[PDB]
Ligand binder design. Structure first.
Ligand SMILES: O=P(O)(O)O[C@H]1[C@@H](OP(=O)(O)O)[C@@H](OP(=O)(O)O)[C@@H](OP(=O)(O)O)[C@@H](OP(=O)(O)O)[C@H]1OP(=O)(O)O
Ligand SMILES: [Mg+2]
Ligand SMILES: [Mg+2]
Ligand SMILES: [Zn+2]
Ligand SMILES: [Zn+2]
Lengths: 241, 193, 113, 93, 199, 255
RNA sequence: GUUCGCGAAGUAACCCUUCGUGGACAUUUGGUCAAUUUGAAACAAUACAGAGAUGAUCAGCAGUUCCCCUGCAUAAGGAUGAACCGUUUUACAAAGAGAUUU
RNA sequence: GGAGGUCAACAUCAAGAACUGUGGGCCUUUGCCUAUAGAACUUAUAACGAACAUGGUUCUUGCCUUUUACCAGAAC
């Protein structure tokens, strides 16, 4: 119902909880239909729960045995990295996976002492403990994630989004605030009103003076007033330091 | 709410979207009452939404600790004996269902079938006399007011022969280290150092 | 942001920048509780004050404003400067403020203006 | 003069009460269930006389709360009649 | 914003005659039909065993600007619609006091935030001028005062007046108002003779 | 009269039309009950059902409870409850209109909320800023399965169809444009007749396509605009003046 | 319906029924929400092009905006996401010179 | 009255080895000293839970085309 509210009708979610397209997608559609980590993480959890409940269903219908039930769901809780695919959405879960794999080693060589190499262990208590302790840690995370997803469904996106200064946009933000800092100090020197069309033509000397600094060309402007040349020379020495 | 195509269910669909914050909690409370190898089927006490959105199993599984140790030791020994006894063990195939098959209804295909045989290591009649009649129940002495407080199932008190019988019967999972000088350089504080 | 004052008795922060607003942050929950929307340019200075002209700010549109933080509006706009007000100061023993300009230093009383 | 020791107290108490009401509303509108452990804690007469009793309703935990809430873009009419004057005084560049 | 929101204005015809009502406050219920913006919807009921549940539909800014109710959309003093109130204020003092109504969903949620008391509400938001114009309405009211083929039907009279008079003077009726060929037809010829007899 | 007999069930619940409509597109959407990957510009059809105002109408459950409102599905022709329906199952007369008068300012006769402005195409419910009483009948050539029928007879059939759903102020059929403008005397009759005669036909048994009336599109009843006839404008101004004098009398008597 | 009485009638004899009768117990659900067209998701198909600083081919970071989409997001993507490329007249005055009129 | 509840609400649960109440004296209420009554639960190879997960920020690393998703130590 989430997939069909979002407008995505060409994605098929079959009863073993796999999401596959019903055609060959365009790129516009592949943009519109990238579901998040939160959807697919909830989806793999439902898949895992489905596998356990189906094996107890098979025990109930009389197709399998008590020992084949125990061996089946012991195999399930050991092989989640092959049966589900939760490792690719929250890779921290590889810890849980390695724990279950390590537990297999210490259980089998207590079980398989003097009785061979076949399947049939079915001592599924420790692996069960590992995945329950994973679940209680990802309750508050997935409540946060799905809360944000569903409120974007009913309520749009916040228009008020501001951008944190990161490594990506730092050399741009230094420029924005450098030029504001320069243009204030030059607007205060003027005895007139500058009326604002002149300001963006004043800052071209700041850009040209920086280009002359990089190229080690001396930057003399012939008819320049003295304190304005002092202001530009000050801020270019700042940027160069 | 199998098929919901009406002007009605406009509210119930929004409830179905609202319950997805709560699906890890429902999965946890389902999965931590996975029945056990010695049980056939157990009844859980669920709490559902009236529109049918989500269904939380509302029950915490309390066990007595030596009784649970002895139950796992009994089924450990029985699974070892059965792996030895069978020549051909058919591990089932996964995933158990087809991808295009809807999950079959409990009320039609499951509930009218009589259940099958659980693990249940067969006990002796006189060596295991005190624990034989209740070892494999769901809550083993849920209603025996001398050996339990009540059906709230919170405190337990046994005699000596019951406790001794659970001591012998749970041999494969006991600690069997009785001196503290075994953990000379494997104690917790050597690990911290 | 170019400015921090700290409230004398109420666990607040008042900050301001090129955003043209003053934000009055709660200090515990770090929520932008009250936003003062008055100016027409970046704010250069914000001073906090314990009695009802509680936030006194000064932007680059040649105004100095005395804010009523409970109501959300301005008590009084001071328009005497001709250019951007770059520096202000509170006087420790007087309950008066001083505002500087490009050559215009004035002194103002608070609670009247 | 400096403001007296009583007006500092009256102003501090009134504004502290206001900031706590705003903080309780902001933490009570959140979707986090953990925020409501950080909050710190009708009848109205509709005419000449009618004596009504304003009750709240108990809502479904799954259906969205504040069903009018949505993300919109709004412009505001900047309206004043306070004219305020701008009280100023009277080749090289 | 909503930390001091004004109490509603519910019409006295809308609240009913029971002296104690309970109404439910939902802090962001519906959004306003005039204003497009959220508000605190109230939904009361008149008596406890009434069938239907009255709820408020417009904002409190939008109600005050028109000086109207929220449940009823009627003017809060005279208890008449906006379109007839503006006619009565416009007909007396001759100002064309007509209410301005915004499309373009940005413009309506722009107009709802200014506080100007829209067109004809300026008079009836005050009791004095609202009584003065009733004093002037006194002056205007004082200066004021089987098949039959019909012909010479008045050009603005409808069919139902003809049928109601015939039901008093005691069916079918087909009247084309252009050609005035009022083809009345009774269900019995005895009723035709009845109507011929009464005239 | 309808006060005597209890209201007959119009169609059974099992014989109701289903959802999942019409197989228009390729894949069916679930959150919206519509079709996707599709092509659709018509999406209209002749309604199978229609009310017969003398045969169907009668007393109901929520007439003894005094409900103000009329059953939407009684009007549309598919009310599957009969004497058990909560709403009223009869044509709005003077007495029922007199009770709705506090609520018709805001919402419908059926009890639906009137929006601020009409629609792009003058759709379903009215607007609460204007008490419109004239209905636009159109799409008649689809309503008659392209049976050209000498327009005075078409105006006679439109006269007869709406004569049963209430009082009529006036009727007009337009020669140049296949449309009609029907003004009722009250508003609730206009609302009732608009929702009662949408998607219907004009055919009646001795008309040679009565067995084949179900194919086609059926007619459109929508809301009429303002009339640019200056005779209609002057009539509207005179009627507005007389209503103004009546309200002057009542406002003076309430002082 | 249960219970405590208070009378009559059947056997009575102090119980047991039919019947009348006073008291006690228990006391106002639900709707912001009606079931196919006419009160409002949208994509997709046929047709045209085939991505900004270019002489040519490209890496990007920003900005302003009553445009937003995917996203758990204050990260990051969406062609540097895109729109940006047009229309442009008065805070208009001073000195001198040449013709018309008084 | 008695037993019980996979019923609810409200207090309380990590600190000079550590709690509350009362009387008397000193200071001027807080606090100090002195005499007295009670303290359930948790705790010394230290903690409610002989069980044990995840999230944020700042450092230090590891995979190295960038961001999510990550490697594994520390502090809050
Ligand atoms: O994981 P699978 O490939 O299905 O096989 C595993 C296991 O693999 P891991 O140890 O990598 O988990 C061992 O196989 P090896 O790769 O170690 O040879 C192991 O074999 P040992 O018994 O020799 O340790 C054992 O096989 P067996 O069933 O014979 O014990 C077991 O199989 P399960 O998957 O059935 O546990
Ligand atoms: Mg860009
Ligand atoms: Mg970008
Ligand atoms: Zn409004
Ligand atoms: Zn009905």
């Amino acid at each position: 119902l989430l997939i069909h509210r979002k407008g995505l009708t060409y994605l098929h979610l079959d009863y073993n909880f796999n999401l596959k397209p019903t055609k060959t997608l365009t790129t516009k559609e592949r943009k519109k239909s990238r579901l998040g980590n939160s959807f697919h993480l909830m989806r793999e959890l439902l898949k895992m729960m489905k596998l356990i409940v189906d094996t107890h269903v098979q025990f109930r219908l009389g197709n399998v045995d008590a020992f084949q039930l125990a061996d089946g769901i012991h195999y399930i809780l050991n092989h989640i990295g092959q049966l589900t695919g939760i490792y690719r959405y929250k890779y921290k879960v590889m810890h849980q996976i390695r724990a279950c794999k390590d537990l297999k080693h210490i259980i089998y060589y207590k079980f398989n002492k003097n009785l061979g190499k076949g399947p049939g262990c079915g001592f599924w208590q420790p692996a069960w403990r590992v995945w329950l302790n994973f679940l209680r840690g990802t309750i508050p995370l997935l409540e946060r994630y799905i809360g944000n997803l569903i409120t974007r469904q009913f309520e749009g996106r916040s228009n008020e989004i501001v951008k944190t200064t990161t490594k990506q946009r730092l050399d741009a933000y230094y420029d924005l605030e450098l030029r504001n800092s320069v243009m204030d100090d030059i607007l205060e020197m003027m005895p007139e009103s500058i009326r604002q069309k002149k300001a963006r033509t004043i800052l071209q000397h700041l850009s040209e003076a920086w280009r002359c600094w990089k190229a080690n060309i001396p930057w003399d402007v012939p008819g320049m007033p003295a304190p304005i040349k002092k202001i530009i020379e000050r801020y270019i020495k700042s940027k160069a330091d | 709410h199998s098929d919901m195509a009406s002007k009605m269910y406009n509210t119930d669909k929004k409830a179905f979207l609202g319950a997805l914050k709560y699906l890890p909690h429902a999965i946890l409370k389902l999965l931590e009452n996975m029945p056990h190898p010695w049980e056939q089927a157990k009844e859980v006490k669920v709490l559902y939404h009236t529109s049918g959105a989500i269904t939380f199993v509302n029950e915490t599984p309390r066990v007595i600790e030596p009784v649970y140790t002895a139950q796992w030791s009994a089924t450990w020994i029985a699974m070892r004996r059965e792996k030895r006894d069978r020549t051909h063990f058919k591990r089932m195939r996964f995933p158990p269902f087809d991808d295009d098959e809807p999950p079959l209804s409990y009320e039609q295909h499951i509930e009218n079938i009589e259940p099958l045989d659980p693990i249940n290591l067969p006990l002796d009649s006189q060596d295991d006399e005190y624990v034989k009649d209740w070892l494999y129940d769901s809550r083993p002495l849920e209603e025996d007011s001398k050996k339990v407080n009540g059906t709230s199932y919170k405190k337990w008190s046994f005699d000596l022969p019951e406790m001794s019988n659970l001591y012998r019967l749970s041999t494969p999972l006991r600690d069997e280290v009785t001196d503290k000088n075994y953990y000379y350089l494997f104690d917790k504080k050597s690990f911290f150092n | 942001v170019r400015t921090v004052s700290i409230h004398p008795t109420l666990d607040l922060i008042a900050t301001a920048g090129r955003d043209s607003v003053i934000k009055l942050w709660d200090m515990r929950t770090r929520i932008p509780v009250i936003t003062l929307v008055g100016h027409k340019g970046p704010i250069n200075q914000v001073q906090c004050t314990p009695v009802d002209p509680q936030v006194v700010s000064s932007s680059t549109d040649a105004t100095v404003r005395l804010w009523d933080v409970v109501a959300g509006k301005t008590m009084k706009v001071l328009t005497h400067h001709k250019r951007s007000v770059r520096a202000t100061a509170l006087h420790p023993k007087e309950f008066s403020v001083a505002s500087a300009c490009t050559d215009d230093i004035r002194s103002w009383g608070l609670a009247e203006g | 003069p400096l403001p007296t020791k009583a007006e500092i107290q009256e102003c501090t108490a009134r504004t502290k009460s206001y900031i706590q009401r705003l903080v309780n509303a902001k933490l009570a509108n959140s979707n986090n269930r953990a925020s409501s452990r950080y909050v710190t804690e009708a009848n109205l007469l509709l005419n000449n006389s009618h004596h009504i009793e304003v009750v709240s309703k108990q809502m479904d935990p799954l259906l969205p709360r504040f069903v009018g809430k949505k993300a919109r873009k709004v412009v505001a009419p900047t309206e004043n009649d306070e004219v305020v004057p701008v009280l100023h005084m009277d080749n090289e560049w | 914003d909503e930390i001091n929101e004004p109490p509603p204005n519910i019409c006295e015809q809308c609240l009913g005659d029971e002296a104690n009502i309970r109404m439910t406050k939902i802090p962001q219920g519906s959004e306003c039909k005039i204003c497009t913006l959220p508000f605190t919807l109230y939904h009361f009921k008149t008596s406890k065993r009434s069938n239907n549940i009255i709820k408020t539909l417009i904002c409190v800014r939008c109600a005050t600007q028109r000086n109207i109710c929220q449940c009823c959309m009627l003017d809060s003093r005279w208890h008449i619609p906006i379109q007839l109130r503006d006619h009565l204020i416009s007909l007396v003092n001759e100002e064309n006091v007509m209410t301005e109504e915004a499309k373009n969903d940005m413009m309506k949620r722009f107009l709802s935030l200014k506080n100007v008391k829209l067109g004809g509400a300026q008079i009836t938001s005050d009791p004095s001028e609202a009584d003065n114009i009733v004093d002037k309405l006194k002056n205007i009211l004082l200066r004021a005062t089987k098949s039959f083929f019909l012909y010479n039907i008045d050009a603005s009279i409808p069919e139902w007046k003809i049928t109601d008079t015939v039901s008093q003077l005691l069916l079918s009726l087909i009247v084309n108002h252009k050609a005035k060929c009022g083809g009345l037809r009774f269900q019995s010829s005895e009723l035709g003779e009845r109507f011929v007899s009464k005239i | 009269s309808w006060r005597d007999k209890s209201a007959k069930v119009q169609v059974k619940e099992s014989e109701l039309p289903s959802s999942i409509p019409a197989q228009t597109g390729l894949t069916f959407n679930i959150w919206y009950n519509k079709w996707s990957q599709g092509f659709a510009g018509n999406t209209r059809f002749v309604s199978p059902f229609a009310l017969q105002p003398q045969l169907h109408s009668g007393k109901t459950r929520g007439d003894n409870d005094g409900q103000l409102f009329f059953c939407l599905f009684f009007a549309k022709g598919m009310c599957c409850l009969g004497p058990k329906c909560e709403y009223l199952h009869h044509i709005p007369d003077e007495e029922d209109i007199g009770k709705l008068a506090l609520r018709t300012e805001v919402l419908d006769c059926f009890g639906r909320e009137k929006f601020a402005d009409y629609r792009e195409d003058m759709g379903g419910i009215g607007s609460f800023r204007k008490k419109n009483k004239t209905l636009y009948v159109g799409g008649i050539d689809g309503a008659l399965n392209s049976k050209h029928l000498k327009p005075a007879q078409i105006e006679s059939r439109i006269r007869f169809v709406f004569s049963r759903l209430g009082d009529i102020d006036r009727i007009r059929y337009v020669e140049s444009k296949n449309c009609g403008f029907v003004k009722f005397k009250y508003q609730a009759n206009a609302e009732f007749a608009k929702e009662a005669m949408s998607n219907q036909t004009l055919l009646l048994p001795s008309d040679k396509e009565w067995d084949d009336r179900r194919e086609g599109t059926g007619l459109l009843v929508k809301w009429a605009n303002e009339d640019p006839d200056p005779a209609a404008q002057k009539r509207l101004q005179e009627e507005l003046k007389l209503e103004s004098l009546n309200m002057m009398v009542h406002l003076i008597n309430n002082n």
